[PDB]
Amino acid sequence: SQLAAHSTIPEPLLLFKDNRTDTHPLRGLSQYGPYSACFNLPGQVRLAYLAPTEHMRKLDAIVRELQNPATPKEATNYYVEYGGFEKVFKVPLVMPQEHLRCLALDECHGVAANGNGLALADKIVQSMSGLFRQKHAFDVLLVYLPASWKKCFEYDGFDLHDRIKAKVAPLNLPIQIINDTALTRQCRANVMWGVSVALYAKAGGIPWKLADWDKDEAYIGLSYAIKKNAEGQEYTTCCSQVFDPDGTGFEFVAYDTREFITDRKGNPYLSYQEMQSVLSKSLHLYQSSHNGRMPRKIFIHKTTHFTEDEIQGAFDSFSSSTEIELVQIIQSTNWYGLKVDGKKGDKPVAPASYPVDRGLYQPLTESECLLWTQGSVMGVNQQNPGQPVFKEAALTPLPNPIMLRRFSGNGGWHATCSSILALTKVDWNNNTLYKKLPVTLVYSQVFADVVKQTPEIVNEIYDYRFFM
Amino acid sequence: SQLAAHSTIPEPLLLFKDNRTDTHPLRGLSQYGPYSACFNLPGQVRLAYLAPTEHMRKLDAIVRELQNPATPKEATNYYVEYGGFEKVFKVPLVMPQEHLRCLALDECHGVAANGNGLALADKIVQSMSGLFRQKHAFDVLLVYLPASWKKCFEYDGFDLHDRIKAKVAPLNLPIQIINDTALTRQCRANVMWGVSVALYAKAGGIPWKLADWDKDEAYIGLSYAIKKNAEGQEYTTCCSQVFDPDGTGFEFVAYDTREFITDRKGNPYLSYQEMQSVLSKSLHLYQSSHNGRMPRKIFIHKTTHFTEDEIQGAFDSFSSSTEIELVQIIQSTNWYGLKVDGKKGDKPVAPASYPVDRGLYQPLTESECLLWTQGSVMGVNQQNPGQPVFKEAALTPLPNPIMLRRFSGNGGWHATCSSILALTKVDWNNNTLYKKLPVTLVYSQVFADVVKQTPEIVNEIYDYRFFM
């Protein structure tokens, strides 16, 4: 008949320049400035170009428009005006000189015509060679892939994005890919906000971070990818770790699960040895980045369920004093929720005009809970201060929640729900308020695609800046 | 007459393709492959010419015999068979087309007859103007000066090599200068190995790097050059830095000491604010290449001693957690060493047939010691597998040790001499086994000479690939 009492958690706060809090990312960025601007790293954001000589004009056009103000056109309820790169980020955006504008060889067009994607990525890096010598002179490289290369973008078992990112990752060169999507979109402010924030993050800056974070907690997310070949299937599993250091930092890294190279798995669930190995690597990274202390309590998030050996390895890799939480994330569920307003004035109990608020979680049983990572948020709207805003109104008429399964734990759902919801906003690669999934899962998925595409880069920890 | 016990440092290991070690550089390139071939960078080494039309066939001959195998004829104890560019570097060396071959203006002959070197350098750089817009069509340019221009090469206060290198440094086009020395030498293996390694390095690749090198350490070398004029003289002191990025790769850069242009000094020693400026600038590169992390320990090498002012500047320019190492390298000393073998069967102790080993360091007092950068090395011989090789045998009958004075340090000599010995082989401009001086001082001296020749290129950071 009636379920147990639910609860809603406040929309989490983002930290900005001089320790200021703002719920709206773009509004806070325009009004206070980026978090790393107070420590002025980078002092400037230097750019480099990677495009054919026939498409340099689009690149200089997009940088120029990045340097100039722009106003929102679509989704104006949450979308604020762009005030220009140097005004918003308090740090200039330099337009690259003649020696920092790289030209791809003409062989790239022929390779694209012949459909060899791997040769295309090799040719792009071969073109970008000189930037390796010049990498001291700039920070971030802009790469433009024309629409004439579409046939080599993503076919069976190949991905140009993952290949190029994997090839340029060891070179310690953050790059940005620009397609016709960023250039032929009606809402220029979306392109401007997203590109500017991504460039600032790639140059080494921190656009924002959660306000109230405990530095004694670690977050782990494991996701898997599917590789198809004639022999069978191989499951590429990679782990992502999120935590903050003791001071003025933000660690967002991903690393592979494989103990040795050429260890093939046909199922997503990892063995006892593999769980011990990966969780110990996570502990070692946290140890290095935390002056030798161990985490008081650890969160592990996974797409699939925890088998018994995995639980045993998780319990055995850490000590007894450190609490361990295992949480299942399920995207698809049979439940949906409807918001009903209460009795106010003369209007009786009636359904609200806007859907259920984001942050509302429903405890289903002693081990399962439904968390609404999608919903309406108060205090964000620009047109009407009192009107709620729902991001995916043009996609989902109603929010569809996700379901959490607790495999081990004695505490309540408040802590895990707060952590999961707070971890949905620090994806600097998007330009919207929040993500449906926590950032650990999406970063693990991206690195899983990257590792599956190129398996030669394993056993090296990599930061988010190289794969966003 | 009994000194402190000496210790010998094992010969440092060089890293090659697929992360595998070999001491002998040429042997490693022949049998294992270059380190940068792992990333297939450069995919190809396109080539360009700049010679008078009377000396074109010399350029074609040198590139051809670069592309063909050659056998050693002198110092055969060390040099191995040369197998051509493609077999050794696993990348092709592409000959220039019709439009990638350049002809110097006929006015160059008249300028050389007039003896004005600066006009000759200007004419060469202006003749190479046609290559600037086709820079995308090649990577490394060869320039040829025939023997008829000897008299305009080096006179008082002038250097054609340094002038041309300074002029082409901001144009962002590596050059390789060849004269009749390369074409009229008996030992073809010498020239072919040197030119091949130099061309591959100037193509942007990493021929080889040290095997066991820490990424938390940085090394700084300071040298000075003297220019004299009617009024007096001033000191052109510069700086250089060797270190490896967070990812796999190599970058080796040098920069000027002068905080502002037209600052004049009459002694090599640097002021407090000068040390602060230079060390803070070096810190910027270090943080830029390592995602803003601090170096755990810093090494500074100078050809002159450190006054109290320099020590205070160095100590205040870094954080408290980073240990500060100041070492003065005294090339010429009054000491030399003789090697004595122990009792071997019936034969008693007797002088060895070959000189002292390279890697032997003798602690003299609390802060002063001699390390043998010159000596005999075992395991690199080709004719006789068991007989050591001492390379400077054709000119010096005995090695001359270099003398090291410390000004700051808690740890023992082991790390200091180990680092100094390791840095002696990373000079890709050197076709022999090693250098007497660490590569930091070599690049500092070369850049000091270049800046002394042309002081208009100050405050711009330049890597080795432009001055090797």
Next chain:
Amino acid sequence: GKSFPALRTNALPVVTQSIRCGVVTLASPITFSELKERISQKSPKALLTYTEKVLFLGGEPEIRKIFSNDEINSIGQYYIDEIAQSVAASTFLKSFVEEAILTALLREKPILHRVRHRTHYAVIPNASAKDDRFLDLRKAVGFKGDLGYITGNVTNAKELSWAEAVSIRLEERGGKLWIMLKPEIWIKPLDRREEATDFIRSRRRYRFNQCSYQILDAWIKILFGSIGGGGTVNISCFPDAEFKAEFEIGTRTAFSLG
């Protein structure tokens, strides 16, 4: 629960706890594939499943149509006590219970029954669109208080047809059984659903919280006949036959306060 706003789900509680089914014992071993083949070939007026013996809901004449007298050894009765635990533990029991509940709900009522992608759907018939019981659903779908069509022809297609429907699913959580409803626009034929995706998207684009609440209430009223009556609606499948299943499912959807 202590305060507002309210969260209204799609889950209808099930009050029944025991199902009395029949056991058909085979002298010769039987498999699921052959049982399904016989079901398809004979088209019986009963529901059957195979965990370890053929469990059926319906009448003996039916399973004697499916099975010859030689094959059948004996016929008995089976009590599925603690239905929730058995459904959670046994997959075939879950499918059987879901099918039985659907067949009990869609009896003697003008609602088409269809299946898509292992899921159960209740589709409004085309011919009986103007029925008076559909007035609430017609009001819920229209715009600005105008009466709206429930079924019709899709735009710009040869003979593609569409009709508004509800998906019925069974879910077990913590020892309690829930029935799940999700409004969804059915397309006939089933295999041509891809050709009308833009049409469905256009139809549901502004189906916000208000319209969704109205549609859910209308579907509850259509399926059960009463809404918010405070009681339970009793449905039975094959009431004439000896082996029948009756269910007690409430009309008020599970909700949460506080």
Next chain:
Amino acid sequence: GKSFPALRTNALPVVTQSIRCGVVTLASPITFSELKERISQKSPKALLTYTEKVLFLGGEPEIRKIFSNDEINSIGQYYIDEIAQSVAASTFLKSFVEEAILTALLREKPILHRVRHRTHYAVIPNASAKDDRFLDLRKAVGFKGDLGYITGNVTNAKELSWAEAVSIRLEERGGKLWIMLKPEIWIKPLDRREEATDFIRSRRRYRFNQCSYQILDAWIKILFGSIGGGGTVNISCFPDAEFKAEFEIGTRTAFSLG
């Protein structure tokens, strides 16, 4: 030291710790330049230096020759205690003690004394080339076990002369005083060393580690007169005079083990 191979340097330890020299207190003021001018004009049979007062080793009749009776006020003695750090801190004392040690070394012994670029050389005479005390040095510079010449003329030269020589330097490191040797081919006249660089390069081309060891041992024997005696050789400067300097220099070159 604990193991082999062994390292043999060219440094001879100096065991002396104090020098008892005399001072020349003169009423009128004295500078180094005119002091050296008087030395050149008079050619004293003694060594003189100027730190703050005129310091000498030798006999008083000499400085009475170089200074008239009116100029000299009084004569006393100076105790140079802690010779090592005094030599390190004071340059004049370093050069003075180095000259005194060399003059003590080359007394009543048939080796010429020469100076080039303010560095001291011990050069064997042409006239006493075939002396028996030079047999070891003749053997060392020989080829295939044959006796080798230790003095001669430079090939393709008009009047150039060459001889085998050793350079002696004084060095102070860490409170210990060392005497350094280095074999070198001396050329007479000094200013025509340009014309014989090919000759020196050819002569020193094959003087490898083994041959250099023999040359160093032969020169140690020539300089000190004993080898491997396990003790120290005492050398003195002007033993007949009142103010004399005596030194205790070992014969075994400083060595180090693993």
Next chain:
DNA sequence: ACCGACGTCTAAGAAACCATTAT
């Protein structure tokens, strides 16, 4: 005198594509 091949049925997600941009 068995543990491998294959059928059924749940849940849950991932991969080559499609499509809109916030009552």
Next chain:
DNA sequence: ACCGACGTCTAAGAAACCATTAT
């Protein structure tokens, strides 16, 4: 009367200019 021009002297390196090619 104090500090600024000259001389001496050590160590030590670089304006430069010739070589010969590894027992």
